Design a protein around this ligand. Structure first.
Ligand SMILES: CCCc1cc2c(NCCc3ccc(OCc4nnn[nH]4)cc3)nc(OC)nc2s1
Lengths: 47, 244, 157, 61
């Protein structure tokens, strides 16, 4: 494993750290699905 | 010797009956509301608190002094560690909603056991280190009043006392703090009142123990009885406040 | 177009809002992508009662019994009540005539359509054209749902 | 079970129970320590101070 492998594993570690941070941050958002029938006043509820 | 032995036996039977009751009804909402794994560990600690009397009445030997040095601290450490972790996870669960939709770290039914065992192992480490420093021994002590029917005593009873006591006091303070933090939780998940009463009554018992121990330096038998009764009373206070 | 998304923050809390009603395709093919959404927000038209309400009730029934949504909570908003109060007089709710009776009957006929009562809850609300407490209701329902899920996961509940 | 001023009745109850506990703990110690006077006075002083502090902290906090 010459410097090529070392550079590859360093880059992979940076990618993994970024992914973990982004996932931990994005696990806090609260997701809400919207449903109903047409012409039921969903626009007013959204606004 | 008869009195303390009878009290210890009754305490052991009561602990077994309570454990059997919780086991039979382990699926009911009120039992699930409290931790079951930590409840079992706390019950084991209470049982050890009662069992310590038989160790303290056995004739001193090369092994009995070691048990006398270990179990005394270990039982209290077990009970208070169980209480601390049990209140802590509920406090963190009800506090985590401020962050939002994030599963708290180490709230599984297995992580709690690991934390409780680590907290107990700290006390075990302290006791074993001090045991290595001064080896157990069974001396035969006689005093300047030449009359003393030579007494048979352990070697260094006081060697590890201050360290263990300090640790236990720290655990009690943390338990009280975390009981205070969780006073606003719903009814089935709130037990601040009982924790406060338990801590207060235990402190009162040991403060009352001090002067009787001092005044009865003569007639060692009285001192031993006034330590067996105190240990059993502490165990009974915990059991009555938390499980009844 | 496709799916429409919105952001809003309340009490230092992040809220993703997914509008999907415009898809116009087979719902059963892609409905499983939303498993794990914390809450389902339903909207029912009251002034469209005379039957559109049979269609709305059938649609509600289907969402409760979907297999993906076994444990998901439902937040229900009953809209068009300001016109409904006046429409009761012209068209009785039988199509004890009063506003309270009709509201209670509607609420009961919807809320009695979830078999697994223990598993999930149906928060209910009456919304008007102008009201600033709706977001507070959403906040107070979402926090309760979060706490219940965290308690159930660790075995305490 | 009577809320009058932020439910002070239960606080009065807590104070009464704690004081009962303190007095029960203290009373036999005097007779047991009748042999030695110094410890007797020290325990009496400590008990009196604690008996006051319980009422204070339990009711007025
Ligand atoms: C609020 C705090 C409560 C606690 C109290 C407490 C404690 N106290 C007992 C201490 C003591 C007293 C007299 C002795 O002399 C008698 C004897 N000893 N051996 N033979 N005779 C020996 C020990 N020990 C420990 O574990 C170490 N943990 C705790 S937690």
């Amino acid at each position: 494993l010459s410097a090529e492998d070392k550079a590859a594993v360093e880059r992979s570690k940076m990618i993994d750290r970024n992914l973990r941070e982004d996932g931990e941050k994005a696990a806090r958002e609260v997701k809400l699905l919207l449903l109903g029938a047409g012409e039921s006043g969903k626009s007013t509820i959204v606004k | 010797a008869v009195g303390p032995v009878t009290i210890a036996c009754l305490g052991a039977l009561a602990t077994l009956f309570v454990l059997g009751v919780f086991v039979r009804h382990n699926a009911t909402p009120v039992v699930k509301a409290s931790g079951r794994e930590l409840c079992y560990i706390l019950l084991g600690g209470v049982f050890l608190c009662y069992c310590m009397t038989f160790i303290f009445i056995a004739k001193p030997s090369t092994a009995v002094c070691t048990l006398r040095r270990l179990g005394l601290g270990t039982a209290f450490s077990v009970c208070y560690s169980a209480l601390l972790t049990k209140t802590n996870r509920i406090a963190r669960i009800f506090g985590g909603a401020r962050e939002g939709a994030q599963r708290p770290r180490f709230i599984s039914p297995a992580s709690q056991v690991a934390i409780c065992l680590a907290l107990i192992s700290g006390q075990l480490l302290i006791v074993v280190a001090w045991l290595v420093v001064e080896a157990p021994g069974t001396g035969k002590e006689t005093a300047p009043e030449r009359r003393e029917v030579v007494t048979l005593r352990c070697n260094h009873r006081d060697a590890s006392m201050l360290g263990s006591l300090a640790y236990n006091v720290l655990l009690i303070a943390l338990c009280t703090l975390y009981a205070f933090k969780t006073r606003k939780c719903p009814e089935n998940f709130n037990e601040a009142k009982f924790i406060g009463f338990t801590m207060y009554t235990t402190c009162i018992i040991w403060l009352a123990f001090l002067p009787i121990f001092y005044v009865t330096s003569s007639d060692y038998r009285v001192q031993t009885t006034t330590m067996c009764v105190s240990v059993s009373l502490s165990g009974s206070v915990v059991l009555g406040c938390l499980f009844a | 177009t496709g799916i429409v998304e919105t952001h809003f923050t309340f009490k230092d809390l992040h809220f993703k809002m997914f509008d999907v009603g415009g898809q116009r395709s087979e719902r059963k093919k892609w409905i499983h992508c939303f498993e794990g959404v914390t809450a389902i927000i339903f909207c029912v038209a009251l002034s469209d009662y005379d039957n559109r309400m049979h269609e709305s009730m059938k649609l509600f029934d289907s969402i409760c019994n979907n297999k993906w949504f076994t444990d998901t909570s439902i937040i229900l908003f009953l809209n068009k009540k300001d016109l409904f109060e006046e429409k009761i007089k012209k068209s009785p709710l039988t199509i004890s005539n009063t506003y309270e009776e009709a509201a209670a009957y509607i609420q009961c006929q919807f809320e009695d359509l979830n078999k697994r009562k223990d598993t999930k809850e149906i928060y209910t609300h009456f919304t008007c054209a102008t009201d600033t407490k709706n977001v507070q209701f959403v906040f107070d329902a979402v926090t309760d749902v979060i706490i219940k899920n965290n308690l159930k996961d660790c075995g305490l509940f």
